[PDB]
Each structure stands twice: as structure tokens, then as C-alpha cells.
């Protein structure tokens with residue numbers, strides 16, 4: 001649950017995937033604006 | 034995240050506040066008035082912003 | 083405690099200062115003057131406060 | 132080191148307004164089959180055109 | 181000619197959440213917008229008139245909400261103006277089932293303004309005359325013609341009239357309803373169908389009626405219509421993805437509504 | 453024959469006056485536009501927004517105009533602001549070299565003109581040559597990218613930084 | 622207890638809080654009328670409208 005998940009594209013853990021889904025990012029527009 | 038977003042929104046919405054001047058949009062201040070008397074309004078907008 | 087009390091007292095004392103206006107009592111600016119000047123004086127008080 | 136800012140400047144101006152359609156012309160007042168005598172001089176109101 | 185409609189059959193009813201319109205011509209998507217404008221407050225007192233064949237005098241009071249549910253076109257038009265004694269301009273709106281006619285010049289307006297139909301053989305028939313609706317007309321600064329307002333179940337017709345800065349604005353909606361429980365519970369915003377640069381002062385108004393003749397016959401009918409008044413209030417409107425007002429909050433209705441306007445959201449979490 | 457025109461400018465709303473004309477609509481180009489007295493500047497683009505038939509503008513959550521309806525062709529045009537940004541200069545010390553690179557922060561490399569042009573997520577990087585290597589960060593550029601002064605003649609290179617030497621215990 | 626020549630009464634922050642009545646020569650405290658914030662206590666609208 002805490003080690004990186006290789007199946008997914010970004011090598012995040014299941015808990016880190018949940019964390020990134022659960023926080024709704026707002027000012028992250030960098031490359032295309 | 035929210036605190037910064039609302040600080041930015043306060044900053045943006047404060048652009049459209051005349052700060053006592055005859056209007057907030059600079060173009061109207063410039064066209065309506067001559068340069069000397071519109072200078073006062075522009076300076077007030079500048080100090081407020 | 084003392085710092086909080088000092089800050090509040092300074093805030094209250096700032097009300098009885100003219101801030102360049104010809105009076106510090108809004109009723110006086112209203113009664114003794116006319117809109118095209120009382121309005122500006124009141125706005126200067128508002129900016130100061 | 133952040134030395135400056137750049138802007139893309141607007142190349143040209145465009146102005147667009149709705150189709151020029153509803154005109155009551157003056158052909159009805161100049162191409163009249165017969166005018167009116169002075170003591171009974173004809174008069175027309177022209178509005179919303 | 182001037183045979184009067186001596187009838188009011190006045191009643192009173194709840195407005196629910198009816199007279200919401202679009203306050204400007206700006207598209208907005210998936211947004212909550214706070215607008216301070218002249219609205220018909222929620223759950224206000226709307227007068228419910230029944231007219232059968234007096235005092236058709238009504239004020240304007242910053243604007244009017246009008247509604248009707250009549251299946252046919254017994255309701256035709258409206259008379260607007262400050263004083264109606266042919267001194268100053270008086271707006272008049274009339275439907276003839278194929279277009280709508282708006283005039284502005286002063287009219288006599290015999291004290292029971294109504295139209296009559298009275299089948300003819302003159303041209304063919306059915307000219308729906310006007311002779312004693314207002315008798316005379318002169319000094320007509322404005323005039324206007326369009327596709328008729330009163331188009332086409334139950335078919336509720338809602339209109340909002342207001343008068344700002346020389347502009348007479350008319351919003352409306354045509355909502356077909358089934359239960360027919362007078363003003364239904366739900367939401368439906370009124371789109372701005374007309375703006376007229378008329379520049380006159382409106383303070384009183386009245387409606388207009390059809391009254392076919394039998395064969396003065398003037399066969400009796402019944403027309404039921406509601407009138408509410410608008411005053412300045414702050415509303416929180418909810419534009420969906422397409423730009424439609426799908427919901428609204430009246431910020432001075434109750435404490436929860438003031439909270440909703442403060443949080444600028446339609447859902448409030450537990451707290452103080 | 454005599455005709456006299458008499459003009460009333462009474463305080464009622466004005467309704468008779470001259471044509472306003474229209475000039476043509478330049479899309480995909482930062483123009484200075486005016487649609488029915490709604491003025492502004494920016495790049496006009498075709499849009500799939502669906503206004504309601506009475507709606508003429510589009511507004512943003514911050515109350516700025518995002519779209520217009522063309523008053524002649526009933527078409528919705530998105531408006532984006534022109535392409536401002538910041539300009540940073542990347543330098544090894546002048547004790548080392550007088551050669552520099554320039555970063556145009558947060559803009560596309562296509563619209564650069566106000567030699568080794570690279571598109572980072574921090575902006576358009578000019579004068580640095582991107583390499584498929586990884587070193588410890590020397591000069592922080594932006595989203596994972598650093599710059600350094602390299603040998604193989606000396607030049608300014610841009611790379612994705614290395615977090616460290618990999619190790620399997 | 623005003624001294625027989627005194628008319629006003631002032632606080633530390635130089636605000637009047639007493640007045641001598643010019644007719645009955647009585648001293649009246651002055652208190653600001655009343656005011657304060659208004660807070661709305663709600664469960665979620667997910668739970669009730671009360």
C-alpha cells in the first residue's frame with residue numbers, strides 16, 4: 001500500500017494515488033496557459 | 034490552497050474599485066477628461082492599486 | 083494582555099484624527115459643507131480609517 | 132536572474148457591428164410624387180432608424 | 181360603447197419562487213452569481229384577480245410581475261402610464277393573434293378599456309375594433325410591431341415589466357404545466373424578449389379583454405390573472421453549463437438563505 | 453422644392469443616427485477588438501460555447517470577458533489575452549563566460565520574437581542545448597530542468613536533473 | 622459625582638459616558654445602544670434546513 005505501484009504510469013503508491021485524487025489542485029497550470 | 038486562491042481573487046477584484054476616483058477603467062478617465070484633470074484620477078488609481 | 087490593549091487603544095484613538103480633512107466628526111462634514119466637497123472630505127476620512 | 136517582462140503587442144484593430152439593415156431612408160421624402168404647399172407644408176416624424 | 185367590467189373577485193396567493201429572469205445578456209456557465217436587482221421576492225403576496233362581465237386601476241411600483249393561465253387569448257394587452265387623461269404619453273400593447281402592436285402616444289382611454297370582436301360581413305369579418313379602448317390618438321413618438329407575445333395543457337404565461345432610464349423592458353416565459361396548481365413549485369427563468377426606448381414615465385397600468393359579441397351582445401367570459409410587485413433584492417443565481425438560470429436563493433428570505441449567500445454556495449456544511 | 457431637417461436631442465433615448473460600419477475579423481492573432489462597444493485586446497478563436505439566443509457576452513468567474521458573439525455572423529469567439537511573460541537570463545559567472553541563455557517564462561516557443569530553442573514547462577528556453585543526460589542540478593530552471601556550463605568547446609546545456617546515484621541494498 | 626462646574630464625562634479613550642442634565646442637574650450615564658455579530662448555526666443542508 002505504500003510502495004510504488006509499477007502497473008500505473010506514475011510510480012506512486014496506492015495511498016499516494018488516493019492522496020493526489022483527494023486534493024483538488026487549482027493553480028497548477030504551467031506548460032499551457 | 035484556498036487561502037492563496039482567495040488572496041489572488043481579492044487582488045483581482047480590487048482592480049475594478051475606483052478608490053474614490055471618477056471611474057475605475059483608465060481609458061474612460063483618459064478620454065473623458067483633459068490630461069491635467071485626468072492626471073489626478075489616474076494618480077489616485079495608481080496609489081490605490 | 084498589554085500589547086493587545088495598546089493596539090485597541092491606538093485603533094480607537096485613530097478615530098479622532100483628521101487625516102487631512104477639515105474635521106473628524108462625519109456629522110460636521112455633512113452639516114457644515116456641501117456634497118461636492120463634503121463627499122470628498124468624507125472619502126478622505128474613509129481612506130484614512 | 133529575472134531581468135524583464137515581455138508582451139505580445141496587438142498588431143491591428145478590428146471593429147464589428149451588426150448588419151446595417153433597418154433604415155427608413157429619405158427616398159420617401161425626396162422622391163415624392165407631389166410635395167405640399169407652404170401654408171400646408173408637409174411634416175414627418177423620423178424615429179427608431 | 182363604454183360598458184363597464186364592474187368586477188374584481190380579488191384574492192391573495194403565495195408567489196413561491198416564480199418571477200426570476202435574466203438580469204443581463206451575459207453568458208455564464210456552471211457559476212453562482214450574486215445580482216442586486218429588482219426582483220419579485222420569494223413567498224410574497226400576489227393578488228389573484230378574476231374578471232367577469234369597478235376598479236381596474238393598478239399602480240406600477242418599480243415594476244410588475246404578471247401571470248395568466250387562460251387557455252385562449254382572453255388576455256390581449258396592457259395600458260401603461262402616469263396619468264391617462266390624454267395629456268402625456270401612454271404606452272399601449274395589443275395582441276391580434278398574428279402580431280403585437282406597441283404605441284406610446286396619449287389616448288382618451290374610456291374608464292373601462294377593453295376590446296370587442298363582433299363578427300362582421302364588412303370586409304369578411306373579425307376586425308377586433310378599438311373605438312372606445314382609447315377613442316383618440318395624437319403626438320405618437322414611438323410605435324412598434326413584432327411577432328405576438330401571447331403564443332399558443334395549462335400554458336402558464338409569465339411577464340415581467342419594468343421601466344429604467346427611459347427603457348421599458350419586458351421579460352417573459354411560457355411554461356406548460358399539468359397539475360395546474362396555480363403557480364407550480366419549481367424553477368423557470370424569464371428571457372428578455374423586448375426592450376423599448378420609450379422614455380416616458382409609467383406609474384399605473386391596466387389589462388385588456390376580448391369580449392366577443394353574441395350575434396351590445398358582449399358574451400360573458402372569465403379571465404384569471406395574478407399580479408405581483410418587484411422590489412430591490414439580492415439574489416444568488418445558479419447558471420448551469422448551458423448558461424441557464426437553474427436555481428436561485430433570495431438572500432433576505434431567512435437566516436439559512438443569508439448563510440447561502442455569504443458562503444456563495446447552495447450547500448452548507450455543519451458549522452457556525 | 454425645399455426640405456428642412458430638424459434634429460431633436462431631447463433627454464429621451466436616442467434612436468436615429470448614422471451607420472457604425474464594421475471591419476473585416478482576424479482570428480488567431482493578437483488584435484485590438486471592439487464588438488458592439490465591448491472593447492479589448494487579445495486573440496480571437498473559434499469556440500464551441502453555446503450561448504443562449506439573447507446572450508451576447510461570456511464572463512469568467514472573476515468577471516472578465518471570455519467570449520463574444522459576432523454581431524454579424526452569429527458565432528461565439530473565445531478571447532484569450534495576449535502572451536505576456538517574464539524574461540530571465542541564465543548565466544555562468546562572468547568570471548567564467550559572457551555567454552547566456554534566456555528563459556521566456558510560461559510562453560510557447562512559437563510566439564517568441566519580441567538558436568537552440570527548447571520548450572520546457574517553465575517556458576521557452578533559448579540559447580541552451582538540451583541533452584539526454586542527468587547531472588546534479590546547477591542552475592534551477594523550472595519543472596525538473598536545470599542548466600549548466602558544459603564541455604562536450606564550452607556551451608550552456610539544459611538537462612533533467614538527477615536525484616542521486618541509484619543503489620540497491 | 623460631578624463637580625458643580627462640570628458638564629461632560631469622559632472615558633480613558635476620550636468618549637463621553639455621562640452628562641449632567643441642564644434642567645434637573647442630574648447625572649445620566651450614556652451607554653451605546655446595542656450591537657453585535659449575528660451567526661447562523663446549522664447542521665449541513667445535507668442533514669436539515671433547520
Ligand SMILES: *[C@@H]1O[C@H](CO)[C@@H](O)[C@H](O)[C@H]1NC(C)=O
Pocket residue numbers: 031032033560561562571
Ligand atoms: C504552441 O503552439 C502550437 C500552435 O501555435 C500548439 O500546437 C502547441 O500545442 C503549443 N504548445 C504549447 C506548449 O502551448
Ligand SMILES: *[C@@H]1O[C@H](CO)[C@@H](O)[C@H](O)[C@H]1NC(C)=O
Pocket residue numbers: 158161162163
Ligand atoms: C429616387 O431617389 C434617388 C435617390 O438616390 C434618385 O437618384 C432618383 O432620381 C429618384 N427617382 C425618382 C423617380 O424620384
Ligand SMILES: *[C@@H]1O[C@H](CO)[C@@H](O)[C@H](O)[C@H]1NC(C)=O
Pocket residue numbers: 276277278279281307
Ligand atoms: C391585427 O390583426 C388583424 C387580423 O389578425 C389584422 O387585420 C390587423 O391589420 C392587425 N393589426 C395590425 C396593427 O397589424
Ligand SMILES: *[C@@H]1O[C@H](CO)[C@@H](O)[C@H](O)[C@H]1NC(C)=O
Pocket residue numbers: 420421422502
Ligand atoms: C444543456 O444542459 C442539459 C442538462 O441540464 C444537457 O443535457 C444538454 O446537453 C445541455 N445542452 C447542450 C447543447 O449540450
Ligand SMILES: *[C@@H]1O[C@H](CO)[C@@H](O)[C@H](O)[C@H]1NC(C)=O
Pocket residue numbers: 150523524525526
Ligand atoms: C448579415 O449579413 C450577411 C450578408 O453577407 C448575412 O450572411 C448574415 O446572415 C447577416 N446576419 C445578420 C445577423 O443579420
Ligand SMILES: *[C@@H]1O[C@H](CO)[C@@H](O)[C@H](O)[C@H]1NC(C)=O
Pocket residue numbers: 643644645646
Ligand atoms: C428648572 O426649571 C424647573 C421647572 O421646569 C424647576 O423645577 C427647576 O428647579 C429649575 N432648575 C434650575 C437649575 O433652574
